[PDB]
Design a protein around this ligand. Structure first.
Ligand SMILES: *C(=N)N(Cc1ccc(Cl)cc1)N(C)C(=O)[C@H](Cc1ccccc1)NC(=O)[C@@H](NC(=O)c1cccs1)C(C)(C)C
Ligand SMILES: *C(=N)N(Cc1ccc(Cl)cc1)N(C)C(=O)[C@H](Cc1ccccc1)NC(=O)[C@@H](NC(=O)c1cccs1)C(C)(C)C
Lengths: 301, 301
């Protein structure tokens, strides 16, 4: 019936995206209740970024240097404070669209939807994974700062990502909605680089299960393996060590398919050693690791 | 800055999705103005599908056999007519959320966003391409019939797909919003199969340009080629013949990058012959063809 990388419906967030401008810089903000959250480097000029003292830079700021637009509407800024690396800009109008929302700090390996915007206008929506080195591989051009990642869990909108940075290597980085960077990064134009990316093993397994469910099963073998033995082959190819809790987490998927986690770990073992010999798994010739077990169970059940 | 397969923000459509039930069957519908569009096979039982006479089946229908819910709300059905392969069910309440909308019949090779729903509830959003054989490769489980594909062009919401069918081969099929099937398919449980899928050449080129823009350029060569010569290698690998209009269409992309279409056709020529030798292009080890030139220019500019 198909398996696709898909994003939560984005309506509940489209209505929270506004435009923020300070000096010659314009980017995006998040309008919840009477507050608009955005990245604090909005107040920085080209020269400031090299070594900005944000507290000092912010004092010199008066509310009229901050210009906020809900679509074409304009919002009145009546205060501005800093929380870690995010600008809180209080406004008169509470957003009548504010949804039921949380501010969550996700875990590496977890996934969220990103609503990409340019000048307060939503552009599109896509799913990203928080890599083990606290980066994400998304689509953030000029004017994309302020786009936020989120999950929808039944009632609630869980905001987990606000985009700040791009790294020399093409990957991305940001903060939670309290303003704390994921990873070691700083909002400063100085040398910093990601750690080594390893690969999210439990997700790859989840992806193979998803593929068995959808008819791709050529990679299934009769072998079985032990965690320690597989995890020795894992370590060779920069794969996250698998754990018993990961196996527990994969329970429902192994059940729906009739394949022990450990039987699939042997199938995975063979694919790291020998590659794919020109066959495909769910339309890839590479192994994929940005699907969580939950993401798969949601779509395959 | 990144290139990702992304879908239009889905808010303007989330609010048009309702639940439809007839007998023991429940699926999705599209509530625009005072009308709810859904697939007409909703009125068919297991036995009917084999050879349904829909006109006859529909006469035996009274409005009370049709049950429609906007969320938990219920809508009153005050009429029901058939238009090709879609049920039009008039209702008392005009949707106060009805957007500015068109009903467009897209062209093979063109792309649209699909808002997947299950029992009137939106589940997620993703981008699909109308294959040259009038199928799509999406994610449509039980209760997904009625999910619609759409594009957003500035003001308007262009509805182009409503999902009806799944094919023995795992691929999907449906109608425009006037109820005309794409492809040769019929809403009947009898033998029918897709034509041979060829590959959308102009899209693959667009994808290579997107990859050059984002730093992947190992596949660039010094050679050049002629359309007829490339299109001879195209025909070998079930690739759509390239045309001068496709080259015109790729103009802006070839401009942004400095690579003549024909210089890229030679790079593509080499990749069909020799494959990728274990390198990747925008995180694939395969060539991709579900990006239009427009889809790329939108994200890379
Ligand atoms: C967001 N709206 N925005 C604009 C933007 C610039 C370049 C690209 Cl490719 C896409 C969008 N961004 C990403 C920025 O304004 C940030 C601000 C910033 C944050 C931290 C340090 C410096 C600047 N610009 C950057 O991410 C820049 N990154 C860096 O200079 C560094 C990365 C690691 C160490 S320094 C650039 C290089 C993307 C301009
Ligand atoms: C939509 N809500 N819905 C349910 C559904 C069934 C199976 C799967 Cl895998 C996913 C969802 N669908 C797809 C249907 O109800 C259709 C209705 C239909 C339309 C045309 C012909 C027959 C039935 N079910 C199907 O698509 C079925 N397809 C076929 O029988 C044929 C395909 C080609 C020739 S006959 C099945 C096989 C998916 C049940």
């Amino acid at each position: 019936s198909g398996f696709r990388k898909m994003a939560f419906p984005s309506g509940k967030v489209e209505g929270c995206m506004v435009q923020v401008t300070c000096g010659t810089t314009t980017l995006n903000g998040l309008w919840l209740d009477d507050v608009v959250y955005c990245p604090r480097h909005v107040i920085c000029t080209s020269e400031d970024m090299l070594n900005p003292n944000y507290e000092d830079l912010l004092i010199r700021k008066s509310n009229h240097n901050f210009l906020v637009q809900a679509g074409n509407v304009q919002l009145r800024v009546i205060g501005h404070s800093m929380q870690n690396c995010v600008l809180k800009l209080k406004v008169d109008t509470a957003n009548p669209k504010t949804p039921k929302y949380k501010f969550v700090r996700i875990q590496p390996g977890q996934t969220f939807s990103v609503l990409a915007c340019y000048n307060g206008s939503p552009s599109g929506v896509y799913q990203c994974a928080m890599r083990p080195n606290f980066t994400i591989k998304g689509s953030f051009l000029n004017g994309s700062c302020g786009s936020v990642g989120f999950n929808i869990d039944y009632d609630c909108v869980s905001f987990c990502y606000m985009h700040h940075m791009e790294l020399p290597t093409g990957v991305h980085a940001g903060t939670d909605l309290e303003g704390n960077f994921y990873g070691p990064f700083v909002d400063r134009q100085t040398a910093q680089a990601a750690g080594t990316d390893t690969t999210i093993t439990v997700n790859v397994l989840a992806w193979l299960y998803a593929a068995v469910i959808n008819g791709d099963r050529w990679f299934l073998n009769r072998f079985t393996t032990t965690l320690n033995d597989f995890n020795l082959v894992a370590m060779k190819y920069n794969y996250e060590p698998l754990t018993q809790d990961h196996v527990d987490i994969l329970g429902p998927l192994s059940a729906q398919t009739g394949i022990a986690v450990l039987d699939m770990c042997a199938s995975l073992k063979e694919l790291l050693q020998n590659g794919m010999n020109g066959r495909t798994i769910l339309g890839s010739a590479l192994l994929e690791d940005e699907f969580t077990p939950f993401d798969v169970v949601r779509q395959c059940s």
